[PDB]
Amino acid sequence: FDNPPTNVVSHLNGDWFLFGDARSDCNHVVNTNPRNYSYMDLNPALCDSGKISSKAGNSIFRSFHFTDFYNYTGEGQQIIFYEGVNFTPYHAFKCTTSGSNDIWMQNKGLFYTQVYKNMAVYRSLTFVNVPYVYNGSAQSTALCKSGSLVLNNPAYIAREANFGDYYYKVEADFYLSGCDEYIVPLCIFNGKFLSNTKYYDDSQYYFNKDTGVIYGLNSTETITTGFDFNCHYLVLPSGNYLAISNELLLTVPTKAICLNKRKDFTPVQVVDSRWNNARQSDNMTAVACQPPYCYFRNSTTNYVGVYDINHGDAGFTSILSGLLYDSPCFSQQGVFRYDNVSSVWPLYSYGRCPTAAD
Amino acid sequence: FDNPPTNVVSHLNGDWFLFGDARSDCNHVVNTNPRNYSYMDLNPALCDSGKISSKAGNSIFRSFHFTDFYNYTGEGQQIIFYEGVNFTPYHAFKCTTSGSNDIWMQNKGLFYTQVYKNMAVYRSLTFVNVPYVYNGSAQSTALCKSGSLVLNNPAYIAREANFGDYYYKVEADFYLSGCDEYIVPLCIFNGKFLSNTKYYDDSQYYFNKDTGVIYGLNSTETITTGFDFNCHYLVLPSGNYLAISNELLLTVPTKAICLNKRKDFTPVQVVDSRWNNARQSDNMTAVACQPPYCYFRNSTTNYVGVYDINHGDAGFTSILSGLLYDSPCFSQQGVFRYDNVSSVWPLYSYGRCPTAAD
Ligand SMILES: *[C@@H]1O[C@H](CO)[C@@H](O[C@@H]2O[C@H](CO)[C@@H](O)[C@H](O)[C@H]2NC(C)=O)[C@H](O)[C@H]1NC(C)=O
Ligand SMILES: *[C@@H]1O[C@H](CO)[C@@H](O[C@@H]2O[C@H](CO)[C@@H](O)[C@H](O)[C@H]2NC(C)=O)[C@H](O)[C@H]1NC(C)=O
Ligand SMILES: CO[C@]1(C(=O)O)C[C@H](OC(C)=O)[C@@H](NC(C)=O)[C@H]([C@H](O)[C@H](O)COC(C)=O)O1
Ligand SMILES: CO[C@]1(C(=O)O)C[C@H](OC(C)=O)[C@@H](NC(C)=O)[C@H]([C@H](O)[C@H](O)COC(C)=O)O1
Ligand SMILES: *[C@@H]1O[C@H](CO)[C@@H](O)[C@H](O)[C@H]1NC(C)=O
Ligand SMILES: *[C@@H]1O[C@H](CO)[C@@H](O)[C@H](O)[C@H]1NC(C)=O
Ligand SMILES: *[C@@H]1O[C@H](CO)[C@@H](O)[C@H](O)[C@H]1NC(C)=O
Ligand SMILES: *[C@@H]1O[C@H](CO)[C@@H](O)[C@H](O)[C@H]1NC(C)=O
Ligand SMILES: *[C@@H]1O[C@H](CO)[C@@H](O)[C@H](O)[C@H]1NC(C)=O
Ligand SMILES: *[C@@H]1O[C@H](CO)[C@@H](O)[C@H](O)[C@H]1NC(C)=O
Ligand SMILES: *[C@@H]1O[C@H](CO)[C@@H](O)[C@H](O)[C@H]1NC(C)=O
Ligand SMILES: *[C@@H]1O[C@H](CO)[C@@H](O)[C@H](O)[C@H]1NC(C)=O
Ligand SMILES: *[C@@H]1O[C@H](CO)[C@@H](O)[C@H](O)[C@H]1NC(C)=O
Ligand SMILES: *[C@@H]1O[C@H](CO)[C@@H](O)[C@H](O)[C@H]1NC(C)=O
Ligand SMILES: [K+]
Ligand SMILES: [K+]
């Protein structure tokens, strides 16, 4: 008898949910010709399960920030993630041509940190639009963009006619409702921002009108180039808020991650989402995935897909294969198929776990 | 054979530490006459261990906020707490005679929440003085006090000579060094605060000069009585900060909980700290003590001490008795003395845990 920790994602019972991308997007097949499921790492037998929310070409972070939006939606006791690759150093995203992808990688890590931590204590994740009211005559403006990627959360509001510089103070009202908690971005350009001969230091506050909490960020960088849009990811309660800009452009949330249905602490499972080695990936989801709230799974091999080089890999297919059955014990080291005896002590475990005793 | 979960605090190996009060203060005995150890729930055999930091009449919260200060100091992999009673509804603390003990109970809960969460990931806790510089000629003033309890953290700075009201903006610089992280209070009077015929709305911000993060609290209550000093407990990095007051009195930290030596996630153990039923206690440490970061232990009986009615209880002596030996498995349900087989599945477990399988 053998009960080793196994390198899979699985589930204790039927109460689970997976968020993903093309590699687990059953619907994508309609856009293959001829129709072919080999682009998937997920087993197509799971296509009717109702336990998957995935979109080819997307990721939760990508949908959070950009106009390229998929309404990821799901509920379960155990949450599993196999997405992230659709925002990587490969995309070379920066708000401006003299920006920094490293900043955006930092943003990515901070975002997934909050997602993973919160999905260990909430059953349900979806996206909600955040309504806001701005009183001026200025409209929103797409200041942050690169190729096909256009930032739309937070929104930037243009300067009013009457102002000749960016030293002004303006505000908008944004209202959070419908969820137990909300993940929203609070961001600034952290750097010396040149506009019409003057260098600015972006400043943005959010204010909960009823709790009275102020969350703010002021620019502190002294560099005049190679800077970008630094974001923090706030986990906020329902309420009515002001977004108060003290310098540069007013920014306000337009989308939130909607967290609902508090649950007993249940660690999430995260699968490394990367490209074939020919493309630059990042380890930000690994950084974000820590005990006790998350188990991280990765293959030992290069991603080499059979459909194309970036889709349908033996290693990741193996990892996802655990979704085809129930497993009793989840641990840092892997999943144990039996709940009785093992040769190693499971670490940070969840479920019915074996003893490594005599 | 029998391996039930047991209602004790214990330790996996010798790497542990206990924070407490008189009920575990070996030194107190010098202040008994004749000398008598029966005031303790801790076994005196542990008096030479070097693994206890306790002071009769004190608590970590009490020392955090008030002039009645004990420098709680300790390091261990597994941290245990048996303190809190020395700040309870019994003490009837309020900043003013028309204040609110309920507010202070809320403060207590919020504080212990941060302590317990952080001591699951740091080995070391102590107190550090927080130096600050205020530029005015005004001195500190003890605005919040009740009987023998006098608040000294945060400090209040009096108004300057030149000001005739409390609508002013002033600041101090405070510097955090020597620790990985710091717990500091950010507080305001949350209410309509009457001074010389005018009603004020307290406002206080802290600003990290290098990260550029602003943490602020503004008063939102409309009541003119029955309000008090609402605190939030920030977990901050080393750095140089400004305390920026926008209304009422400037407040600034004078003491921090010093968190050092990051460790692998290890749940803390907390023992209910209460008075005999003749006195009003509270459940704020229970509220603060949640999975997966904390296990809470409580006796099933009234606290009835043998030394006096509030010292030396059979139930709590029993709970602490587990410190006299090593135990392999810690769980929500209790401590299992054996790592092999049990009849229940340990929940949120830490250590070498038994299987409830056939
Ligand atoms: C954060 O940045 C804002 C905007 O720069 C600061 O507010 C401005 O501060 C300068 C003083 O250096 C004044 O000249 C402006 O009038 C202020 N603008 C406002 C209030 O809209 C703000 O003080 C910074 N917050 C801090 C340091 O906590
Ligand atoms: C938090 O409270 C402060 C102090 O009341 C507010 O700052 C004052 O706001 C009033 C406007 O209602 C002005 O009359 C004062 O001049 C301001 N004092 C200052 C800036 O020192 C502040 O706006 C509040 N913060 C919010 C609402 O985010
Ligand atoms: C109009 O040309 C410039 C300028 O020098 O003013 C070029 C300037 O480009 C620079 C400095 O590399 C751009 N600022 C930034 C940080 O990208 C700056 C801004 O895009 C532009 O001023 C609008 O700024 C705001 C705050 O909306 O535009
Ligand atoms: C001087 O008498 C009074 C006053 O009406 O002004 C009584 C006043 O007592 C009240 C309103 O119950 C006190 N304010 C509060 C909230 O306790 C108030 C303050 O203690 C005093 O004004 C000092 O206030 C500040 C901000 O230092 O003092
Ligand atoms: C996403 O889908 C959920 C479920 O249908 C819905 O409640 C929510 O409003 C949607 N969010 C959008 C479209 O932003
Ligand atoms: C992520 O990558 C950096 C190197 O770029 C490394 O320092 C860090 O340890 C990595 N973290 C994880 C969790 O793999
Ligand atoms: C995943 O494993 C592959 C192959 O060992 C390795 O190249 C890669 O760095 C790992 N990814 C992370 C995020 O650790
Ligand atoms: C599906 O794609 C795989 C991998 O490219 C290929 O071997 C196979 O011919 C395809 N099947 C069909 C029916 O096109
Ligand atoms: C462990 O469980 C497996 C599967 O039921 C079984 O083959 C083996 O005998 C068990 N070992 C025990 C109970 O010691
Ligand atoms: C508390 O004790 C520790 C250890 O001796 C010391 O480093 C620290 O400065 C003390 N804190 C005080 C006295 O505020
Ligand atoms: C604390 O006491 C209140 C009643 O005052 C109760 O609602 C709450 O559930 C209690 N919490 C715990 C953890 O015992
Ligand atoms: C501890 O147990 C006692 C006796 O059952 C009970 O009265 C008390 O409410 C409990 N305390 C907490 C914080 O639950
Ligand atoms: C210690 O106190 C206990 C409980 O009050 C009492 O029974 C005993 O007489 C005391 N012992 C001494 C030596 O005073
Ligand atoms: C459990 O361990 C105890 C103590 O060693 C022993 O008495 C008992 O036989 C063990 N049961 C097993 C190994 O099934
Ligand atoms: K801004
Ligand atoms: K203040």
mmCIF file of N, CA, C and O in Angstrom, chain B residues 218-283:
data_model
loop_
_atom_site.group_PDB
_atom_site.id
_atom_site.type_symbol
_atom_site.label_atom_id
_atom_site.label_comp_id
_atom_site.label_asym_id
_atom_site.label_seq_id
_atom_site.Cartn_x
_atom_site.Cartn_y
_atom_site.Cartn_z
ATOM 1 N N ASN B 218 -11.904 59.846 10.448
ATOM 2 C CA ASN B 218 -12.752 60.993 10.754
ATOM 3 C C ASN B 218 -14.013 60.574 11.493
ATOM 4 O O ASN B 218 -14.623 59.524 11.214
ATOM 5 N N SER B 219 -14.376 61.400 12.469
ATOM 6 C CA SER B 219 -15.592 61.213 13.258
ATOM 7 C C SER B 219 -16.823 61.283 12.376
ATOM 8 O O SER B 219 -16.940 62.150 11.513
ATOM 9 N N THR B 220 -17.736 60.339 12.576
ATOM 10 C CA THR B 220 -18.996 60.308 11.831
ATOM 11 C C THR B 220 -20.247 60.250 12.716
ATOM 12 O O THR B 220 -21.333 60.549 12.252
ATOM 13 N N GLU B 221 -20.095 59.908 13.988
ATOM 14 C CA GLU B 221 -21.226 59.880 14.953
ATOM 15 C C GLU B 221 -21.883 61.258 15.142
ATOM 16 O O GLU B 221 -21.217 62.289 15.144
ATOM 17 N N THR B 222 -23.197 61.238 15.323
ATOM 18 C CA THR B 222 -23.983 62.468 15.527
ATOM 19 C C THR B 222 -24.409 62.648 16.980
ATOM 20 O O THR B 222 -24.915 63.705 17.359
ATOM 21 N N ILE B 223 -24.204 61.616 17.789
ATOM 22 C CA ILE B 223 -24.474 61.723 19.243
ATOM 23 C C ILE B 223 -23.543 62.700 19.956
ATOM 24 O O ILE B 223 -22.365 62.844 19.615
ATOM 25 N N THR B 224 -24.098 63.369 20.960
ATOM 26 C CA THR B 224 -23.369 64.395 21.714
ATOM 27 C C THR B 224 -22.974 63.901 23.089
ATOM 28 O O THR B 224 -22.326 64.608 23.876
ATOM 29 N N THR B 225 -23.366 62.668 23.356
ATOM 30 C CA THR B 225 -23.060 62.017 24.627
ATOM 31 C C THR B 225 -23.017 60.518 24.448
ATOM 32 O O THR B 225 -23.555 59.984 23.474
ATOM 33 N N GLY B 226 -22.356 59.839 25.376
ATOM 34 C CA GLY B 226 -22.281 58.384 25.327
ATOM 35 C C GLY B 226 -21.330 57.885 24.245
ATOM 36 O O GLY B 226 -21.354 56.722 23.867
ATOM 37 N N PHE B 227 -20.506 58.792 23.740
ATOM 38 C CA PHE B 227 -19.435 58.420 22.795
ATOM 39 C C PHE B 227 -18.076 58.368 23.477
ATOM 40 O O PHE B 227 -17.885 58.838 24.595
ATOM 41 N N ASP B 228 -17.114 57.822 22.758
ATOM 42 C CA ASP B 228 -15.774 57.643 23.325
ATOM 43 C C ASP B 228 -14.692 57.573 22.240
ATOM 44 O O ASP B 228 -14.912 57.880 21.063
ATOM 45 N N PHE B 229 -13.529 57.123 22.678
ATOM 46 C CA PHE B 229 -12.314 57.162 21.891
ATOM 47 C C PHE B 229 -12.231 55.834 21.138
ATOM 48 O O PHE B 229 -11.898 54.785 21.696
ATOM 49 N N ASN B 230 -12.563 55.913 19.859
ATOM 50 C CA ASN B 230 -12.570 54.753 18.985
ATOM 51 C C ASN B 230 -11.172 54.528 18.433
ATOM 52 O O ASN B 230 -10.617 55.405 17.793
ATOM 53 N N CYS B 231 -10.639 53.325 18.631
ATOM 54 C CA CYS B 231 -9.331 52.973 18.085
ATOM 55 C C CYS B 231 -9.352 51.849 17.060
ATOM 56 O O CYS B 231 -10.096 50.851 17.193
ATOM 57 N N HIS B 232 -8.475 52.047 16.078
ATOM 58 C CA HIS B 232 -8.035 51.043 15.136
ATOM 59 C C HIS B 232 -6.569 50.715 15.395
ATOM 60 O O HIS B 232 -5.767 51.570 15.833
ATOM 61 N N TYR B 233 -6.253 49.459 15.136
ATOM 62 C CA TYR B 233 -4.922 48.937 15.402
ATOM 63 C C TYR B 233 -4.212 48.581 14.119
ATOM 64 O O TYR B 233 -4.491 47.563 13.465
ATOM 65 N N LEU B 234 -3.303 49.477 13.738
ATOM 66 C CA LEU B 234 -2.587 49.362 12.482
ATOM 67 C C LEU B 234 -1.372 48.479 12.665
ATOM 68 O O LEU B 234 -0.659 48.585 13.654
ATOM 69 N N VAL B 235 -1.147 47.640 11.678
ATOM 70 C CA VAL B 235 0.075 46.822 11.608
ATOM 71 C C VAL B 235 0.944 47.420 10.509
ATOM 72 O O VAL B 235 0.620 47.354 9.307
ATOM 73 N N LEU B 236 2.008 48.073 10.957
ATOM 74 C CA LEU B 236 2.796 48.954 10.108
ATOM 75 C C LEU B 236 4.233 48.458 9.946
ATOM 76 O O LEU B 236 4.768 47.763 10.829
ATOM 77 N N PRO B 237 4.876 48.827 8.818
ATOM 78 C CA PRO B 237 6.277 48.531 8.597
ATOM 79 C C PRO B 237 7.175 49.573 9.232
ATOM 80 O O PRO B 237 6.705 50.652 9.613
ATOM 81 N N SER B 238 8.456 49.253 9.348
ATOM 82 C CA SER B 238 9.398 50.276 9.810
ATOM 83 C C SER B 238 9.307 51.455 8.860
ATOM 84 O O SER B 238 9.138 51.304 7.629
ATOM 85 N N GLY B 239 9.489 52.638 9.429
ATOM 86 C CA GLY B 239 9.531 53.844 8.629
ATOM 87 C C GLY B 239 9.370 55.117 9.415
ATOM 88 O O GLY B 239 9.233 55.118 10.643
ATOM 89 N N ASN B 240 9.366 56.211 8.667
ATOM 90 C CA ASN B 240 9.165 57.521 9.247
ATOM 91 C C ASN B 240 7.810 58.046 8.831
ATOM 92 O O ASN B 240 7.473 58.058 7.645
ATOM 93 N N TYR B 241 7.057 58.474 9.835
ATOM 94 C CA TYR B 241 5.656 58.838 9.709
ATOM 95 C C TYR B 241 5.370 60.239 10.202
ATOM 96 O O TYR B 241 6.044 60.765 11.095
ATOM 97 N N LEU B 242 4.341 60.829 9.621
ATOM 98 C CA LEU B 242 3.679 61.996 10.204
ATOM 99 C C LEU B 242 2.328 61.627 10.761
ATOM 100 O O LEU B 242 1.582 60.855 10.156
ATOM 101 N N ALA B 243 2.045 62.171 11.938
ATOM 102 C CA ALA B 243 0.713 62.165 12.523
ATOM 103 C C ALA B 243 0.171 63.560 12.237
ATOM 104 O O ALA B 243 0.742 64.595 12.686
ATOM 105 N N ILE B 244 -0.883 63.584 11.439
ATOM 106 C CA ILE B 244 -1.488 64.833 10.960
ATOM 107 C C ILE B 244 -2.900 64.934 11.485
ATOM 108 O O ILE B 244 -3.779 64.172 11.095
ATOM 109 N N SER B 245 -3.095 65.870 12.403
ATOM 110 C CA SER B 245 -4.411 66.126 13.019
ATOM 111 C C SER B 245 -5.098 67.263 12.255
ATOM 112 O O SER B 245 -4.491 68.298 12.027
ATOM 113 N N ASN B 246 -6.362 67.058 11.894
ATOM 114 C CA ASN B 246 -7.137 68.046 11.113
ATOM 115 C C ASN B 246 -8.247 68.717 11.911
ATOM 116 O O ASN B 246 -8.898 69.647 11.428
ATOM 117 N N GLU B 247 -8.471 68.196 13.107
ATOM 118 C CA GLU B 247 -9.489 68.692 14.041
ATOM 119 C C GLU B 247 -9.299 68.103 15.420
ATOM 120 O O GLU B 247 -8.806 66.997 15.578
ATOM 121 N N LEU B 248 -9.702 68.870 16.415
ATOM 122 C CA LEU B 248 -9.541 68.495 17.814
ATOM 123 C C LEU B 248 -8.064 68.367 18.197
ATOM 124 O O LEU B 248 -7.206 69.077 17.698
ATOM 125 N N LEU B 249 -7.767 67.479 19.123
ATOM 126 C CA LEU B 249 -6.380 67.327 19.602
ATOM 127 C C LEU B 249 -5.570 66.364 18.726
ATOM 128 O O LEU B 249 -6.044 65.316 18.333
ATOM 129 N N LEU B 250 -4.338 66.749 18.442
ATOM 130 C CA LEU B 250 -3.374 65.837 17.796
ATOM 131 C C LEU B 250 -3.100 64.616 18.674
ATOM 132 O O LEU B 250 -2.841 64.739 19.869
ATOM 133 N N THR B 251 -3.181 63.436 18.063
ATOM 134 C CA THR B 251 -2.826 62.193 18.727
ATOM 135 C C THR B 251 -1.737 61.453 17.956
ATOM 136 O O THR B 251 -1.689 61.445 16.719
ATOM 137 N N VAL B 252 -0.840 60.860 18.718
ATOM 138 C CA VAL B 252 0.353 60.239 18.170
ATOM 139 C C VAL B 252 0.744 59.028 19.013
ATOM 140 O O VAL B 252 0.667 59.082 20.237
ATOM 141 N N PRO B 253 1.171 57.935 18.364
ATOM 142 C CA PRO B 253 1.616 56.771 19.148
ATOM 143 C C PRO B 253 2.857 57.034 19.986
ATOM 144 O O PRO B 253 3.755 57.763 19.559
ATOM 145 N N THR B 254 2.875 56.428 21.172
ATOM 146 C CA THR B 254 3.986 56.483 22.109
ATOM 147 C C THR B 254 4.576 55.109 22.430
ATOM 148 O O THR B 254 5.681 55.001 22.956
ATOM 149 N N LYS B 255 3.809 54.074 22.112
ATOM 150 C CA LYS B 255 4.208 52.678 22.303
ATOM 151 C C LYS B 255 3.698 51.854 21.139
ATOM 152 O O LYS B 255 2.629 52.142 20.582
ATOM 153 N N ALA B 256 4.478 50.854 20.780
ATOM 154 C CA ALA B 256 4.064 49.841 19.784
ATOM 155 C C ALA B 256 4.304 48.441 20.281
ATOM 156 O O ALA B 256 5.202 48.192 21.083
ATOM 157 N N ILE B 257 3.484 47.506 19.807
ATOM 158 C CA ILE B 257 3.857 46.096 19.880
ATOM 159 C C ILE B 257 4.882 45.847 18.778
ATOM 160 O O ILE B 257 4.630 46.099 17.602
ATOM 161 N N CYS B 258 6.035 45.352 19.200
ATOM 162 C CA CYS B 258 7.169 45.058 18.347
ATOM 163 C C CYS B 258 7.117 43.597 17.952
ATOM 164 O O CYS B 258 7.277 42.720 18.794
ATOM 165 N N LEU B 259 6.899 43.364 16.666
ATOM 166 C CA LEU B 259 6.855 42.017 16.065
ATOM 167 C C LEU B 259 8.164 41.704 15.308
ATOM 168 O O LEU B 259 8.568 42.414 14.401
ATOM 169 N N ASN B 260 8.830 40.643 15.713
ATOM 170 C CA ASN B 260 10.090 40.241 15.109
ATOM 171 C C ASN B 260 10.192 38.739 14.871
ATOM 172 O O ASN B 260 9.560 37.924 15.554
ATOM 173 N N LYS B 261 11.025 38.421 13.890
ATOM 174 C CA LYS B 261 11.408 37.047 13.527
ATOM 175 C C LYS B 261 10.253 36.297 12.921
ATOM 176 O O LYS B 261 9.546 35.542 13.573
ATOM 177 N N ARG B 262 10.084 36.510 11.631
ATOM 178 C CA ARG B 262 9.041 35.809 10.889
ATOM 179 C C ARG B 262 9.205 34.277 11.035
ATOM 180 O O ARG B 262 10.317 33.722 11.024
ATOM 181 N N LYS B 263 8.086 33.586 11.185
ATOM 182 C CA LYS B 263 8.091 32.132 11.310
ATOM 183 C C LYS B 263 7.016 31.511 10.441
ATOM 184 O O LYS B 263 6.070 32.170 10.032
ATOM 185 N N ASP B 264 7.173 30.223 10.190
ATOM 186 C CA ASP B 264 6.115 29.481 9.501
ATOM 187 C C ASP B 264 4.839 29.592 10.349
ATOM 188 O O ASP B 264 4.881 29.549 11.590
ATOM 189 N N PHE B 265 3.721 29.750 9.653
ATOM 190 C CA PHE B 265 2.404 29.853 10.293
ATOM 191 C C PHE B 265 2.191 28.789 11.373
ATOM 192 O O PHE B 265 2.176 27.587 11.102
ATOM 193 N N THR B 266 1.987 29.261 12.583
ATOM 194 C CA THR B 266 1.787 28.398 13.761
ATOM 195 C C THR B 266 0.672 28.982 14.641
ATOM 196 O O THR B 266 0.856 30.036 15.265
ATOM 197 N N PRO B 267 -0.495 28.323 14.695
ATOM 198 C CA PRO B 267 -1.604 28.894 15.456
ATOM 199 C C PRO B 267 -1.273 29.155 16.914
ATOM 200 O O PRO B 267 -0.578 28.367 17.573
ATOM 201 N N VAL B 268 -1.774 30.287 17.395
ATOM 202 C CA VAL B 268 -1.634 30.639 18.811
ATOM 203 C C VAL B 268 -2.707 29.943 19.599
ATOM 204 O O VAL B 268 -3.707 29.451 19.039
ATOM 205 N N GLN B 269 -2.463 29.843 20.906
ATOM 206 C CA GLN B 269 -3.425 29.273 21.845
ATOM 207 C C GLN B 269 -3.816 30.312 22.860
ATOM 208 O O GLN B 269 -2.952 30.984 23.443
ATOM 209 N N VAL B 270 -5.120 30.502 23.013
ATOM 210 C CA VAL B 270 -5.663 31.532 23.910
ATOM 211 C C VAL B 270 -6.607 30.910 24.933
ATOM 212 O O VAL B 270 -7.507 30.167 24.556
ATOM 213 N N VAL B 271 -6.341 31.220 26.207
ATOM 214 C CA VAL B 271 -7.178 30.809 27.343
ATOM 215 C C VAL B 271 -8.036 31.976 27.808
ATOM 216 O O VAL B 271 -7.559 33.101 28.040
ATOM 217 N N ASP B 272 -9.320 31.696 27.922
ATOM 218 C CA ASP B 272 -10.292 32.685 28.390
ATOM 219 C C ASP B 272 -9.829 33.263 29.718
ATOM 220 O O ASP B 272 -9.545 32.521 30.671
ATOM 221 N N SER B 273 -9.738 34.590 29.739
ATOM 222 C CA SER B 273 -9.310 35.339 30.913
ATOM 223 C C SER B 273 -10.473 36.133 31.471
ATOM 224 O O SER B 273 -10.872 37.177 30.921
ATOM 225 N N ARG B 274 -11.025 35.610 32.570
ATOM 226 C CA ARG B 274 -12.217 36.184 33.184
ATOM 227 C C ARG B 274 -12.162 36.142 34.694
ATOM 228 O O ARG B 274 -11.382 35.427 35.290
ATOM 229 N N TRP B 275 -13.051 36.939 35.259
ATOM 230 C CA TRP B 275 -13.267 37.013 36.691
ATOM 231 C C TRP B 275 -14.274 35.954 37.085
ATOM 232 O O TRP B 275 -15.023 35.436 36.254
ATOM 233 N N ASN B 276 -14.289 35.669 38.372
ATOM 234 C CA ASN B 276 -15.433 35.013 39.002
ATOM 235 C C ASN B 276 -16.707 35.754 38.583
ATOM 236 O O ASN B 276 -16.689 36.962 38.376
ATOM 237 N N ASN B 277 -17.806 35.016 38.478
ATOM 238 C CA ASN B 277 -19.052 35.525 37.886
ATOM 239 C C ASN B 277 -19.622 36.761 38.578
ATOM 240 O O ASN B 277 -20.473 37.454 38.009
ATOM 241 N N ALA B 278 -19.159 37.027 39.796
ATOM 242 C CA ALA B 278 -19.661 38.162 40.587
ATOM 243 C C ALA B 278 -19.253 39.481 39.951
ATOM 244 O O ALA B 278 -19.739 40.550 40.321
ATOM 245 N N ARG B 279 -18.327 39.383 39.003
ATOM 246 C CA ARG B 279 -17.777 40.547 38.296
ATOM 247 C C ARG B 279 -18.040 40.372 36.824
ATOM 248 O O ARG B 279 -18.083 39.245 36.327
ATOM 249 N N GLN B 280 -18.220 41.493 36.139
ATOM 250 C CA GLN B 280 -18.521 41.475 34.703
ATOM 251 C C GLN B 280 -17.251 41.324 33.878
ATOM 252 O O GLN B 280 -16.333 42.128 33.968
ATOM 253 N N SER B 281 -17.241 40.277 33.071
ATOM 254 C CA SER B 281 -16.164 40.017 32.140
ATOM 255 C C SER B 281 -16.668 40.289 30.744
ATOM 256 O O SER B 281 -17.735 40.842 30.582
ATOM 257 N N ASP B 282 -15.890 39.903 29.745
ATOM 258 C CA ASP B 282 -16.281 40.096 28.331
ATOM 259 C C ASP B 282 -15.747 38.980 27.467
ATOM 260 O O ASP B 282 -14.877 38.240 27.897
ATOM 261 N N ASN B 283 -16.251 38.864 26.242
ATOM 262 C CA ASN B 283 -15.823 37.763 25.376
ATOM 263 C C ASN B 283 -14.981 38.225 24.213
ATOM 264 O O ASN B 283 -14.871 37.537 23.195
#
